[PDB]
Symmetry: C2
Subunit: 83 residues, 2 copies
């Protein structure tokens, strides 16, 4: 993975996740993700986990309108020295 930013939006899109903002700040990335399936956002990070990415920050809230969905307050990804 030459472009770490890709895995996020790539895995995001396939999981129906909207990463509005991304920032390749070395290891840590700044991700902005609209309300999501707790499934999708996990599996997406699980997917990024394959990239050597760790959830460096995940900040989240349950939605009142459709329980079982979540609201990502702020999300930071961390990466390996691998790349």
């Amino acid at each position: 993975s030459e472009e770490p930013s890709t895995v996020i939006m790539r895995e995001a899109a396939r999981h129906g996740l909207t990463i509005v903002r991304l920032q390749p700040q070395g290891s840590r990335l700044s991700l902005t993700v609209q309300p999501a399936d707790f499934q999708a956002l996990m599996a997406w990070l699980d997917a990024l986990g394959q990239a050597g990415m760790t959830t460096a920050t995940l900040a989240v809230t349950a939605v009142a309108q459709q329980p079982g969905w979540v609201t990502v307050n702020t999300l930071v990804l961390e990466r390996s020295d691998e790349k």
Copy 2:
């Protein structure tokens, strides 16, 4: 599930998660969970998800000492009117 507090610690323990603090504040609960497998803490919430519990807040950070593990900053659970 007459005692919602049980599912959390029950599912916690089976997933190797330490819920130090729990608060049955109606729908929302205050959970304090020591550093965890992102797998375990998800699967535990997935498990609580079976209880009718939503992750009302999940606040988390990646650990520097053993990547792929996470640090739960603050976690709030939300419950159904089912109980």
